[PDB]
Design a protein around this ligand. Structure first.
Ligand SMILES: *[C@@H]1O[C@H](CO)[C@@H](O[C@@H]2O[C@H](CO)[C@@H](O[C@@H]3O[C@H](CO[C@H]4O[C@H](CO[C@H]5O[C@H](CO)[C@@H](O)[C@H](O)[C@@H]5O[C@H]5O[C@H](CO)[C@@H](O)[C@H](O)[C@@H]5O)[C@@H](O)[C@H](O[C@H]5O[C@H](CO)[C@@H](O)[C@H](O)[C@@H]5O)[C@@H]4O)[C@@H](O)[C@H](O[C@H]4O[C@H](CO)[C@@H](O)[C@H](O)[C@@H]4O[C@H]4O[C@H](CO)[C@@H](O)[C@H](O)[C@@H]4O[C@H]4O[C@H](CO)[C@@H](O)[C@H](O)[C@@H]4O)[C@@H]3O)[C@H](O)[C@H]2NC(C)=O)[C@H](O)[C@H]1NC(C)=O
Ligand SMILES: *[C@@H]1O[C@H](CO)[C@@H](O[C@@H]2O[C@H](CO)[C@@H](O[C@@H]3O[C@H](CO[C@H]4O[C@H](CO[C@H]5O[C@H](CO)[C@@H](O)[C@H](O)[C@@H]5O[C@H]5O[C@H](CO)[C@@H](O)[C@H](O)[C@@H]5O)[C@@H](O)[C@H](O[C@H]5O[C@H](CO)[C@@H](O)[C@H](O)[C@@H]5O)[C@@H]4O)[C@@H](O)[C@H](O[C@H]4O[C@H](CO)[C@@H](O)[C@H](O)[C@@H]4O[C@H]4O[C@H](CO)[C@@H](O)[C@H](O)[C@@H]4O[C@H]4O[C@H](CO)[C@@H](O)[C@H](O)[C@@H]4O)[C@@H]3O)[C@H](O)[C@H]2NC(C)=O)[C@H](O)[C@H]1NC(C)=O
Ligand SMILES: *[C@@H]1O[C@H](CO)[C@@H](O[C@@H]2O[C@H](CO)[C@@H](O[C@@H]3O[C@H](CO[C@H]4O[C@H](CO[C@H]5O[C@H](CO)[C@@H](O)[C@H](O)[C@@H]5O)[C@@H](O)[C@H](O[C@H]5O[C@H](CO)[C@@H](O)[C@H](O)[C@@H]5O)[C@@H]4O)[C@@H](O)[C@H](O[C@H]4O[C@H](CO)[C@@H](O)[C@H](O)[C@@H]4O[C@H]4O[C@H](CO)[C@@H](O)[C@H](O)[C@@H]4O[C@H]4O[C@H](CO)[C@@H](O)[C@H](O)[C@@H]4O)[C@@H]3O)[C@H](O)[C@H]2NC(C)=O)[C@H](O)[C@H]1NC(C)=O
Ligand SMILES: *[C@@H]1O[C@H](CO)[C@@H](O[C@@H]2O[C@H](CO)[C@@H](O[C@@H]3O[C@H](CO[C@H]4O[C@H](CO[C@H]5O[C@H](CO)[C@@H](O)[C@H](O)[C@@H]5O)[C@@H](O)[C@H](O[C@H]5O[C@H](CO)[C@@H](O)[C@H](O)[C@@H]5O)[C@@H]4O)[C@@H](O)[C@H](O[C@H]4O[C@H](CO)[C@@H](O)[C@H](O)[C@@H]4O[C@H]4O[C@H](CO)[C@@H](O)[C@H](O)[C@@H]4O)[C@@H]3O)[C@H](O)[C@H]2NC(C)=O)[C@H](O)[C@H]1NC(C)=O
Ligand SMILES: OC[C@H]1O[C@@H](O[C@H]2[C@@H](OC[C@H]3O[C@@H](O[C@H]4[C@H](O)[C@@H](O)[C@H](O)O[C@@H]4CO)[C@H](O)[C@@H](O)[C@@H]3O[C@@H]3O[C@H](CO)[C@@H](O)[C@H](O)[C@H]3O)OC[C@@H](O)[C@@H]2O)[C@H](O)[C@@H](O)[C@H]1O
Ligand SMILES: OC[C@H]1O[C@@H](O[C@H]2[C@@H](OC[C@H]3O[C@@H](O[C@H]4[C@H](O)[C@@H](O)[C@H](O)O[C@@H]4CO)[C@H](O)[C@@H](O)[C@@H]3O[C@@H]3O[C@H](CO)[C@@H](O)[C@H](O)[C@H]3O)OC[C@@H](O)[C@@H]2O)[C@H](O)[C@@H](O)[C@H]1O
Ligand SMILES: *[C@@H]1O[C@H](CO)[C@@H](O)[C@H](O)[C@H]1NC(C)=O
Ligand SMILES: *[C@@H]1O[C@H](CO)[C@@H](O)[C@H](O)[C@H]1NC(C)=O
Ligand SMILES: *[C@@H]1O[C@H](CO)[C@@H](O)[C@H](O)[C@H]1NC(C)=O
Ligand SMILES: *[C@@H]1O[C@H](CO)[C@@H](O)[C@H](O)[C@H]1NC(C)=O
Ligand SMILES: *[C@@H]1O[C@H](CO)[C@@H](O)[C@H](O)[C@H]1NC(C)=O
Ligand SMILES: *[C@@H]1O[C@H](CO)[C@@H](O)[C@H](O)[C@H]1NC(C)=O
Ligand SMILES: *[C@@H]1O[C@H](CO)[C@@H](O)[C@H](O)[C@H]1NC(C)=O
Lengths: 240, 717, 239
């Protein structure tokens, strides 16, 4: 009785950047974005395709069902997670991402969306520091002051709630920063990137950065609140 | 005063040099650089010597002791002491730590360099280019209970910035400025013009610079709860504000936009015939022929000296005009600006920095002194010498043309395409290395022109003012007021503006204001900005009432309407319904009735940096024990209430259809009395409780300490 | 290995800057016919469009171009060639579509403009983007090829800036002489520094693909039509 998806993925052409959102595993979406040049195909990934456990029969790859330029809003549902493409500001469009969970009582809860209030930097920011095509990436997502962040690897901070902390993604003795975290809102998030960077768990914005990359890749999975054993069931099905 | 026994300490720690000097009262200045010494032409926003301090002359690079940091040392100036230490269990002197000597003799650690056993270097250097310029990341320790106030302006609805990351990139309504106070009893200034990052994490505070040749910061200590001294030290370091001209304290009429000369003359005729006082009429943008002409289009403003004189004859009001920093090819000044190198430019390609009005443009170089003087020669010829002697320096955030997206003026879809923000070339550096200076130097362009025409020195009494949307460290030194930028005309926006102005106060900015009623229409709220609907008419009257108790009372916005009889929808005190006209005019009269109180509190800000609009921790943290937590949680009682001067307590109504409003009256320190008097009922209440007062549409919840006749006299200090 | 050229291209090619409207072109063919002077191809130069990026003759001066090409072939038997620039301006009817589908190159920071011309700052279309090559042929085949103008003059497609070794083209020689750095723009195949030499080669390829698609012919076989290019690279003789 699983709410299987009706689309293999959505590919948005937003100017020079392409965003490929695909249903991935149970109650999960996989988002990939790149400016100008398509993925080489030799990028390093830490997630399984298809997931170790999920609704799928075969791997997704780059497959998608619908292509748009993001002029109009769209909606895609997989399991209990729903994606809603929207505009920025008062506009009605479909180049901004937002993720909801369908609760047991029929209502919906906003897990997170791309941090794009009226006056703010682009939630998918690209910057070219070198003469080549490799770029640095800064992706921003909304957050609430009451949110709680669990995981993010190991660190001697004497805290299990990582909210309000910045975690640099550079390894050294006793410090293994890993961008895999659970939120008490009922969702988990995987920044599937091997590049060094930064984890910002701010009061109103969650931001991940990549020092140098050719492709941004993350996965978001939803679960009913308080049910952390399912979140870990989904994370392990994605990463091992 | 505990004067220091050393002029400074210079540490040679490998290839990096650290120069720590006593600076002002209870302050230390720290400068560090790897390999190459400072050129001496770095951009600095602090005074040497401070405007007020123990010193007789400037410090410069002078120091008393030189060491390699092999052994620990101690240096004391005032109540702050520096202790150089090792890292880990080591005994050395290459790590910095700062303590305050309390009144009871004991000491409290303000902060040290974040260096636990396993951690990155608290002074991290990185070379991204082939040259010697470097990126810097400086880390300081922090505690989970700490509270951060200031950091500039932002629409975050918080006065406690703990747990937030603040990017140092300017855009509309967002002026990140690395000057903050901590509730531990110290202030900190990251004296750097480079773009970067502010990390106020749970256990680590980090500042970064994208490209620089020198790191420079100042730390100053004060006894806990005593924020008035922190602001006294900050203003002595970065600038003591001048006294504003008396006319600027009145009612400022503005909108988007008064389009031709005869429309402005009928506006003054309306204020005169209706016997409604007005102190300044503002002319908005798009009033020029081309971007960069810096003059009113004669086809719509044929005789502006006659216009300003007629406006002054009917209302006595002064005039203000708008200018943008962008110049297009169709400008009469484009060839001259291009030839003399007075324009910024992207570092490859044609050099255009953004777009507007269907043309791609280039911002003038405010860091170039020749460009600043070229621009005043236009403003003085076409405005100042023609009766318009106040200037609206709009859309000068720096880099792009005022927004966080490129291709301004085009479709919102194109604006949303993530074109990278430009790292432009300036005369003083690049956008990444010196970008934060651009709006600060733009204010300076008008300040230099003002002081030159009046033959007065900076810091003295102003004859005229400028209206700016951005700034930086020490922007309070100019005859210039900052406003919160483009806001939406909805109820939630009105509640968020308060915390932005309170954060500006903690940054050192006193001359702050908003757009009464908001600026932009919210397309998802059908009544937003509609001056003919009762829904927005209610919102505007609540908003206009609040601006009465702000450093500057000004109305402005881009309204919508059902009936239009001009170029744009109206925004005048008689444009919101017949029943609302007497309400708006009453607050206009009340504003002029507070003139003595306004000039008195603006003067103390000029002498001491005495904050004008005051967050509740500055006056009642020592007193009310409940306030420490109400600020930590960013309660509406602390993000939406404030002290306007030493006597008034203000709390705007931020909800529709409301007749009672809950105001938290803080404790004042006399438990057997009732010090709070409600303005509209004259009823007295005791401190330390939340009260629900009658708040009809015409009344804004305002309490006052002492007698009303004394605060109206100005004698409050 | 180069293809064999069409026989008509080996004759006399008449061109200048510039034949401005349709009636001037028709009187030119009438002159060759009345004087019995042979001509094999008539060329229409640039600035014959309404906006940069429209990729069509301005109807205010070329009202019926299918009739113009047919009249030219009736009087002289000559084929026709028209000019197109790779620049796109905001006033273009194709600007919104080119921007939304990512068919324009761009400088890597700032608004993205790559040069200037005709008093407007412009962006070059991305010849390395296969989708952009298709977009441009859909314009040329609609407004030229299917209307008797089946040879194309792909001018000012050197890559990076707009055809010159200086930025701010079309402006004063003093401004042009100011050493604004040549742009390291973003392409779909790389940057100007990493793949820039491909731009004019891929621009020739755009029309070669269009020519071979219309005639159902393989590249390298006999050509029915030609293109006039000012730049190229390794192996450009294959077109
Ligand atoms: C004291 O201090 C406190 C702070 O410390 C302060 O609290 C702050 O208060 C304000 C106002 O009270 C709060 O602001 C609101 O926040 C809401 C939540 O925002 C987030 O989530 C939404 C998505 O929300 C959808 O789904 C959830 C869950 O399912 C629902 O609960 C929601 O209702 C909403 O549902 C709709 O849309 C769904 C999807 O399409 C549908 O499925 C569903 O059916 C519904 O139709 C995100 O969109 C937000 O993202 C935005 O902001 C983030 C981060 O900034 C950005 O990253 C992102 O890009 C976006 O910009 C966000 O994540 C908002 O929903 C709410 O929005 C309303 O008002 C604002 C104006 O302020 C409008 O601009 C906005 O359009 C919304 O207006 C509509 O609804 C209002 C009233 O509800 C109507 O009046 C209005 O007409 C309009 O109607 C629209 O929808 C109607 C629905 O039927 C429809 O009828 C109409 O036709 C019309 O279309 C607002 O922003 C803020 O969060 C508080 N902050 C905190 C920390 O608590 C407090 O106020 C202070 N108190 C006092 C007295 O001062
Ligand atoms: C439940 O959870 C709770 C939280 O989740 C948890 O709380 C945590 O508990 C731990 C353990 O208690 C706390 O850790 C301590 O933190 C202290 C404060 O550290 C900060 O400040 C110091 C500098 O402070 C000085 O000045 C202040 C005020 O003036 C004094 O109060 C201090 O005592 C101290 O004074 C000395 O030095 C002064 C000047 O030099 C002198 O004037 C004075 O006379 C004193 O000699 C900073 O140095 C610290 O910085 C370090 O960490 C930051 C950030 O990580 C880095 O940036 C920086 O580089 C440094 O690494 C910090 O900012 C520490 O002082 C305290 O340290 C002692 O123990 C640790 C081992 O844990 C030793 O490694 C360390 O050397 C210290 O040891 C000395 O003193 C101890 C006992 O006090 C002796 O046992 C020991 O022998 C040693 O002796 C030395 O000094 C003696 C002084 O008399 C002397 O007699 C000896 O001869 C010898 O010289 C420790 O790290 C932690 O903060 C809590 N965390 C939080 C969030 O609260 C709680 O435990 C949990 N509960 C349970 C049941 O689990
Ligand atoms: C950037 O680039 C862009 C383009 O990429 C540049 O834009 C271009 O600039 C060029 C020149 O710089 C322009 O060429 C001129 O165009 C005008 C306009 O022509 C049009 O509009 C005419 C009238 O329109 C009005 O009425 C119509 C009625 O329907 C109405 O719809 C409309 O709203 C408006 O109110 C039309 O009549 C005319 O059409 C005619 O001719 C067509 C050609 O074949 C034909 O198709 C039509 O059937 C119709 O017959 C057309 O649509 C032209 O007028 C102008 O031509 C004059 O000047 C040129 C020299 O530049 C000269 O060679 C011509 O002979 C002509 O000269 C007459 O008047 C002169 C007075 O100035 C006079 O001196 C001449 O002698 C001549 O007149 C008389 O005697 C002679 C012989 O004795 C006789 O032949 C005449 O009939 C007459 O009796 C140019 O072609 C482009 O149009 C323009 N393109 C665009 C899109 O704007 C831009 O400048 C650049 N920008 C920058 C910053 O660099
Ligand atoms: C980018 O930005 C630029 C600017 O930064 C934008 O440009 C501007 O756009 C605005 C509006 O979009 C324009 O304002 C409009 O200007 C016109 C033109 O006005 C001038 O010329 C008039 C006619 O001139 C002729 O005769 C003279 C002889 O001297 C010749 O030289 C000319 O060549 C012409 O042949 C002239 O009559 C006007 O003068 C009058 O008013 C002035 C000022 O009060 C007096 O000094 C004069 O004495 C004289 O009375 C003027 O010089 C105006 O006509 C427009 O007004 C109308 O429309 C308004 C709303 O748009 C409305 O509020 C007005 O009431 C008025 O309405 C008219 O129509 C109504 C109903 O249809 C009638 O009821 C009413 O009677 C009247 O008929 C308006 O003010 C700017 O001019 C223009 N600026 C520039 C430099 O071009 C540009 O649009 C932007 N572009 C992009 C892509 O974003
Ligand atoms: O940007 C070009 C693009 O704008 C489209 O507007 C969208 C945009 O609106 C912002 C704009 O609002 C004006 O006011 C309008 C309001 O938009 C209408 O809803 C209302 O009915 O009428 C009022 C008055 O005409 C303000 O006057 C503008 O200042 C404001 O634009 C900002 O302007 C500043 C500089 O002044 C600039 O820096 C900013 O970049 C710019 O946003 O955003 C909100 C969307 O809902 C609007 O659709 C427009 O529709 C379109 O045609 C095109 O012109
Ligand atoms: O470049 C703009 C700038 O030109 C100034 O002209 C200078 C320039 O001339 C080059 C230009 O020549 C045209 O032919 C002119 C000729 O130059 C004149 O001497 C003659 O009297 O008139 C003819 C035609 O009217 C060509 O038609 C143009 O192609 C050529 O311009 C170059 O154009 C190509 C594209 O066509 C472009 O890619 C180049 O960037 C551009 O340079 O250089 C020689 C100087 O002696 C001239 O003074 C002009 O004065 C000025 O107003 C401005 O328009
Ligand atoms: C200066 O004073 C500090 C403490 O105030 C002391 O540790 C140091 O030895 C003194 N140095 C000199 C030269 O007096
Ligand atoms: C002041 O206004 C009155 C209005 O009648 C006018 O008579 C008088 O000349 C004006 N003075 C000036 C300097 O314009
Ligand atoms: C102000 O600048 C002017 C230049 O127009 C100069 O002549 C004058 O001396 C300056 N005023 C001073 C130095 O007081
Ligand atoms: C000037 O403004 C008045 C008042 O709004 C208006 O009636 C008139 O049409 C305007 N004139 C022009 C040319 O815009
Ligand atoms: C409140 O007192 C003031 C003077 O202190 C007076 O002007 C006002 O009318 C009083 N309002 C009342 C009694 O409602
Ligand atoms: C071309 O058509 C014309 C009629 O418009 C006719 O007189 C002439 O014979 C034709 N010539 C050729 C070569 O078809
Ligand atoms: C050429 O491309 C078109 C689409 O543009 C396609 O329909 C056709 O099959 C291709 N081949 C030929 C010979 O037309």
């Amino acid at each position: 009785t699983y709410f299987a998806p009706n689309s293999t993925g959505l590919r948005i052409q937003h100017g020079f950047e392409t965003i490929l959102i695909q249903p991935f595993g149970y109650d999960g979406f996989r988002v990939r974005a790149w400016p100008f040049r398509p993925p080489s195909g030799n990028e390093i990934s830490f997630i399984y395709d298809p997931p170790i456990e999920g609704y799928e029969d075969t791997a997704h790859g780059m497959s998608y069902d619908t292509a748009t330029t993001g002029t109009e809003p769209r909606t895609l549902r997989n399991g209990n997670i729903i994606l809603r493409t929207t505009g920025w500001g008062g506009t009605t469009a479909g180049y901004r991402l937002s993720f909801y969970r369908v609760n047991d009582d029929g209502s919906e809860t906003l897990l997170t969306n791309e941090y794009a209030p009226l006056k703010s930097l682009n939630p998918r920011y690209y910057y070219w520091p070198g003469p080549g095509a490799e770029f640095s990436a800064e992706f921003s997502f909304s957050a609430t002051p009451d949110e709680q962040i669990y995981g993010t690897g190991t660190q001697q901070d004497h805290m299990i709630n990582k909210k309000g902390s910045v975690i640099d993604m550079v390894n050294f003795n006793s410090y293994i920063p890993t961008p895999v975290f659970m939120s008490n809102k009922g969702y988990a998030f995987i920044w599937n990137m091997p590049a060094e960077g930064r984890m910002e768990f701010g009061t109103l914005r969650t931001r991940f950065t990549a020092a140098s990359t050719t492709l941004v890749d993350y996965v978001i999975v939803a679960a009913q609140p308080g049910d952390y054993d399912t979140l870990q069931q989904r994370i392990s099905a994605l990463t091992g | 005063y505990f004067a220091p026994n050393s002029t400074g300490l210079r540490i040679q720690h490998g290839f990096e040099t650290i120069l720590i000097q006593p600076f002002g009262y209870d302050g230390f200045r720290v400068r560090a650089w790897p390999f190459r010494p400072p050129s001496g032409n770095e951009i600095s926003f602090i005074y040497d010597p401070p405007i007020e301090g123990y010193e007789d002359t400037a410090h410069g690079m002078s120091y008393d002791t030189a060491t390699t940091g092999t052994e620990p040392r101690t240096l004391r100036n005032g109540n702050i002491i520096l202790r150089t230490t090792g890292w880990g269990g080591t005994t050395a002197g290459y790590r910095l730590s700062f303590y305050r000597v309390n009144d009871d003799g004991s000491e409290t650690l303000l902060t040290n360099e974040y260096a636990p056993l396993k951690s990155l270097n608290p002074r991290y250097y990185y070379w991204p280019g082939p040259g010697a310029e470097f990126s810097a990341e400086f880390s300081f320790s922090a505690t989970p209970d700490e509270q951060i106030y200031g950091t500039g302006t932002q629409q975050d609805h918080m006065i406690n910035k703990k747990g937030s990351v603040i990017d140092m990139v300017n855009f509309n309504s967002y002026i990140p400025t690395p000057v903050f106070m901590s509730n531990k009893g110290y202030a900190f200034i990251w004296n750097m013009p480079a773009e970067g990052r502010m990390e106020f994490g749970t256990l680590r505070t980090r500042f970064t610079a994208a490209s620089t040749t020198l790191v420079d910061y100042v730390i100053v200590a004060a006894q806990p709860g005593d924020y008035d001294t922190l602001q006294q030290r900050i203003s002595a370091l970065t600038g003591r504000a001048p006294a504003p001209p008396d006319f600027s304290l009145g009612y400022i009429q503005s909108k988007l936009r008064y389009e031709n000369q005869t429309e402005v003359e009928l506006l003054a005729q309306n204020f005169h015939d209706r016997n409604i006082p007005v102190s300044m009429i503002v002319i908005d943008y798009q009033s020029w022929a081309h971007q960069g002409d810096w003059a009113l289009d004669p086809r719509l403003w044929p005789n502006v000296a006659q216009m300003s004189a007629r406006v002054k004859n009917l209302t006595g009001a002064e005039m203000m005009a708008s200018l943008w920093p962008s110049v297009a090819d169709d400008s009469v000044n484009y060839a001259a600006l291009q030839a003399n190198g007075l324009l910024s430019a992207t570092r490859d390609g044609p050099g255009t920095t953004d777009s507007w009005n269907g043309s791609y443009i280039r911002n003038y170089d405010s860091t170039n002194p020749s460009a600043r003087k070229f621009l005043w020669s236009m403003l003085k010829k076409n405005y100042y010498d023609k009766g318009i002697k106040n200037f609206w320096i709009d859309q000068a955030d720096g880099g792009a043309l005022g927004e966080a997206y490129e291709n301004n003026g085009q479709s919102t879809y194109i604006e949303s395409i993530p074109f990278t923000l430009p790292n432009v070339n300036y005369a003083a550096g690049t956008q990444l290395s010196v970008g934060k200076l651009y709006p600060w130097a733009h204010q300076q362009a008008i300040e230099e022109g003002f002081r030159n025409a009046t033959d007065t020195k900076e810091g003295s009494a102003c004859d005229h003012v400028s209206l700016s949307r951005s700034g930086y460290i020490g922007s309070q030194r100019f005859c210039s007021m900052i406003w919160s930028g483009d806001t939406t005309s909805v109820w939630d926006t009105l509640a968020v503006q308060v915390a932005s102005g309170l954060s500006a106060a903690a940054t050192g900015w006193g001359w702050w204001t908003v757009d009464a009623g908001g600026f932009e229409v919210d397309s998802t709220v059908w009544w937003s900005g509609n001056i003919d609907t009762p829904e927005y008419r209610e919102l505007y009257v609540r908003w206009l009432a609040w601006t009465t108790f702000l450093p500057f009372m000004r109305t402005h916005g881009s309204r919508t309407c059902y009936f239009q009889d001009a170029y744009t929808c109206a925004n005048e005190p008689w444009s919101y319904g017949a029943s609302n006209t007497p309400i708006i005019v009453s607050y206009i009269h009340l504003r002029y009735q507070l003139g003595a109180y306004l000039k008195s509190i603006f003067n103390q800000f000029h002498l001491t940096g005495r904050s004008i609009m005051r967050p509740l921790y500055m006056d009642f943290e020592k007193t009310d024990p409940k306030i420490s937590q109400l600020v930590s949680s960013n309660s509406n009682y602390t993000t939406q209430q404030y002290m306007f001067g030493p006597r008034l307590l203000v709390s705007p109504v931020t909800l529709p259809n409301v007749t009672e409003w809950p105001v938290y009256l803080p404790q004042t320190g006399q438990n057997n009395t009732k010090p709070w008097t409600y303005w509209w009922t004259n009823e007295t209440y005791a401190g330390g409780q939340v009260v629900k007062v009658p708040a009809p549409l015409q009344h804004i919840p305002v309490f006052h300490l002492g007698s009303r006749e004394e605060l109206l006299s100005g004698n409050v200090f």
